[PDB]
Design a protein around this ligand. Sequence first.
Ligand SMILES: [Zn+2]
Lengths: 573, 571, 105, 9, 9, 96
Amino acid sequence: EWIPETLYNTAISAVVDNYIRSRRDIRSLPENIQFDVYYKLYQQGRLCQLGSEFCELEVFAKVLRALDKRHLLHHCFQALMDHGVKVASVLAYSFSRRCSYIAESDAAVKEKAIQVGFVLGGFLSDAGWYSDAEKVFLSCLQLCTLHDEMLHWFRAVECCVRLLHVRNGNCKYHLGEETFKLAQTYMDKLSKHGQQANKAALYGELCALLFAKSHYDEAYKWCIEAMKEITAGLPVKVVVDVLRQASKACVVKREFKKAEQLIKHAVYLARDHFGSKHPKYSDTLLDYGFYLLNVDNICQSVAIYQAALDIRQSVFGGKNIHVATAHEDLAYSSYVHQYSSGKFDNALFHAERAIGIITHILPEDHLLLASSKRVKALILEEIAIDCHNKETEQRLLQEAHDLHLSSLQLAKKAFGEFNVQTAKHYGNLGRLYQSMRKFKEAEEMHIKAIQIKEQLLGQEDYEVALSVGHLASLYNYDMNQYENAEKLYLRSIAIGKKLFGEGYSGLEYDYRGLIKLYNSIGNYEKVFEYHNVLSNWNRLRDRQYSVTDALEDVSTSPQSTEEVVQSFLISQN
Amino acid sequence: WIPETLYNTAISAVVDNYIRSRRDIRSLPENIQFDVYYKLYQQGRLCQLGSEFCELEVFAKVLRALDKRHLLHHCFQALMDHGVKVASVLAYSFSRRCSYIAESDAAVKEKAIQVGFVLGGFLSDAGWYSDAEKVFLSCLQLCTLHDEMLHWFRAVECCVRLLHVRNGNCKYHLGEETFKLAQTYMDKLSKHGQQANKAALYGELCALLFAKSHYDEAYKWCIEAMKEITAGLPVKVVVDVLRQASKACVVKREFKKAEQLIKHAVYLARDHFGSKHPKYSDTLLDYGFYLLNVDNICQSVAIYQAALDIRQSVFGGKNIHVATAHEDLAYSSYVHQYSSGKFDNALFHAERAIGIITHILPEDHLLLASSKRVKALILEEIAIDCHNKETEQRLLQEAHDLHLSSLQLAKKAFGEFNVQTAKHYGNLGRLYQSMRKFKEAEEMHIKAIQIKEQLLGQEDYEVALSVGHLASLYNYDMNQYENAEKLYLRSIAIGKKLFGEGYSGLEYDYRGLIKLYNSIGNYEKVFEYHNVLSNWNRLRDRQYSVTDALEDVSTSPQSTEEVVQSFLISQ
Amino acid sequence: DVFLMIRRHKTTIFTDAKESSTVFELKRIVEGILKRPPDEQRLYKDDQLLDDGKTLGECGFTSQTARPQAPATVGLAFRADDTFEALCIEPFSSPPELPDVMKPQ
Amino acid sequence: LTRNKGPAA
Amino acid sequence: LTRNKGPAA
Amino acid sequence: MYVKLISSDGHEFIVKREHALTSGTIKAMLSGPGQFAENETNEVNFREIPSHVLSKVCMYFTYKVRYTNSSTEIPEFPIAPEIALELLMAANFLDC
Ligand SMILES: [Zn+2]
């Protein structure tokens, strides 16, 4: 049709092409005009002229005030950080240095700087530069702790809530507990005078911290508290975050019934208020995929993660920690999905894209990198046992050994010796040593994984069932302790049947191992019994399988807020 | 902790309000401007730094800080990795100002040349020879106009540098006419009752003719260069002449005479420049060349890796000097680990060199061919040492593509009857032997032997390698034993005459000769060659006790006059 | 530990003292520097006189507002013929006012 | 196959 | 190891 | 033990001698004919450095002397945006 271009966009093109000399007058333009000039500079590919203007807190504060166009600002900022210029570190250092010069000034400029720091730290937390947003929030905290007043207590507790989020995402859990204690101190000071701050976001962040620290029970308690402290006047972001973290704490506490409603309502809120192309909606989809993967809904869990990656990769450019987390989650879900197919080409592609990104942006001694190694190794080792070569298989086993060893050392250094994820690493090493034809160490690895996951978690949990299944597969096939293998198979089958019912997909390998065990030990009547049991299992597997997409189950909700929260809370007794 | 300096604190505080003081930093003293720009680099503000280093007004005041020049060589590199084409922009700006200043007095034009000399020297030091050649061409155009003695002296001083930037860019055809023009200016300056020290020019011509594989002419011109070394020469010129003369002596089979030259060059580089200087890195690189061509490979890797670590710390990442260090260390690790098969490190260095060169140089460049050939050599031995035949047919096909690209580049530039294309033919023969193409391998090795015997005498190192390759093809695979016998004997004769009884390839030659005489019936000769091989292995084990090559030079071994005079009186 | 600037017209004394130290000890310091007896000096903080018996922390000189990197101004006057002039702290030279980059032309 | 899936990401 | 090494870089 | 750092405007910043010897240039000024001032304090004339810059230099002297070799966390020296350019040339010149 060849529609003539808008005079706004035509002048924007003319001004940008003149940017060599009109670079000082553009900084004095209205905020909506000024951002469009910089977006046109990005679209023309002139990132060096764009990056020399976003490295300044004053200029970046005027483009941060365009709240509707922040979905474009995130992509521009990611392009700048991929360009090579460290805009995130430069802006954080500029704000941290500039706040100290006015921390002794009047309260009005202090509040203006606190607002600018909230905007900038929120942007850098959304983008994923948690280490570069911790500086901004820390500086806001020193701005918030010089005058004794009600609103400064409010700003300080908000600073500690947001600073708890940038320390969970940076895997700084030994500072997060201190930050939460300081936040509780300021909140108790605020409630001392009779003004009660709202603790939904704080308790949600603490729940996310404790879940990340693999303290599932205390995370469940704190998410219960956060749901108890949800009101009607909360922002949608806080409600969505609390619902997501409560669902994640519930699904790892094997309460799939409450977690389903919580995360479905969270997805409905995120899609309704924000939209289908928002970073927060992408995070909510990522947590929804986590729930689906942990409730044996793998086929649509892969599709949900692919929806989460397609949003984060469209908003946050190419090389981001958020895109990296989406890649490492989609790689593991694809790995789980094709575990009975062997087609680990897309899963390995996503797992290697989640390490080539993090190694660029994060140090090698970072905890969040270690998980991305795990997802690769469980893929690579599998590619070893499906390939038709021997040297390739040995090389893949060596590489996966390096990955699991590095991840285990990182987990031991950060978390400690005895928690859930260190035992997950031990179980991974047990599986690897079973594949590496070294079963004497595999027995020890599985035994210590069982010990850690049984003295900390329950004796009837999903992870304990998974590890007893792994250990009994180690025994009945190679180590040949048939009594222990039989009892662990029965334990795993009982736990899986209790948790996910008969339709659990993880019972197939246990049934196959038990059939092989009985063929190797006798009792052919029991062999036929478990064979028809496996036939019934496959019948139930093919039945009720043609289910709709999980993004369709989250329709326009017939349950609103203060109904999902109330249903979750009143069911705790 | 110690308090931060008020200088550094004020630098941090003047960078932060950078827009409010961007035009005032350019009015700072010349040793504060570079510190501010280095803080811009350190802070990660590469986008704000590129817009400042691309101006010759600003870069001229940065090039005059000589203590913190090694810092600048990193910053200027980072921008060239950042995507800011600083070198080409600076060369274009200098060419534009030269065009605008050519119609002016000789007093102001001389200052524009001196700014041009330091900028061109920086761009040639950093490895941007394609962009340093434009600056030196502009300086030569400035010097051409006036015909006084000072302008002729500046013109020959810019032609001894224009020859250097046309050798690192592999433009020897233009290098010949550049040397002709420098010789013309030297003759004109000599006709006016004044003599110019023609040591740097002759050293650069030696480098050109050695790179062009004209080792006889390279030796003659390095002798003529070393005749012109005086006491008043700069250390850079003396080091360059010593280094190029050492390479010419090595390739002319003068290992006893090149040893003193290269050891004194390394001593001079480590004394004046220091242990972390790019010129010291160049001397280490050519010292490793000398050590690699005298069958001292076991420590050659220890010298290239020392040379690479200096270049990779000063010149950052994607630089041609780092790429040259990689492609040289990749070939040494190929040789040093040829008997071990652990070419994972050698391949890592080889693919890193091509990854750098393909980014910064066109696909039709000679310096890419050498990097491709090293990776192709490493891929040959990895293919013949793996187990999967799909890998054996993919790696060898990639090696075939790399060798064909290298051969077509060397044939387009050097020609057909040169030595580089002859050794490319020899490598093609080796690869075709690996690919079971025995007839074409024989043809390639015959061509290589013909070309190398036509040029490199009859008892040279390269023709010995080609003869050994053809004889291993005849013996182990083609089963033409009576033809391979004479070639083994000639290879043994050359290896014993040149490198004595400690040559590394003598192992492969003895093993091939043992199998040769075993498959024909001369069993007592087979036994005597077993005990000869055992004696060779014992001798090599005894010769393994050699200290590191960076300790042979020691402290103050000789001086320039003694070494130059010894080389001169030694023919 | 408290850091001050005694600002008798153009002079400026960058001395250090403790919070527990008295004002008379500060006058003794100025005596050791300006060779004037403590009875000749009258110290002023923000146009408010300091009593001799008051400690430095009593008058409002804490280690949070008079840190070494930003010491607190303390006025001072000298007796002239059995009198006392008012504080005459002359201001430092005004720095070149850098214009705001967002100020329209 | 031989055994069950991989524990967590 | 039927052959020798390669000539030059 | 005290030195009078006279500025270009006539301001006489009387700083402790140990503090002022932090900078190399003032140490050089107080060495040789510059230490012949018998009248107690050694007056150092700074005809180029203005009062607002020399005041911040003296504050840096008493900041670095106090905060030297201290195991505690050390705050950065507060330099105003409008004074950083002038303080930078005085930090080079004074070698502090
Ligand atoms: Zn850039």
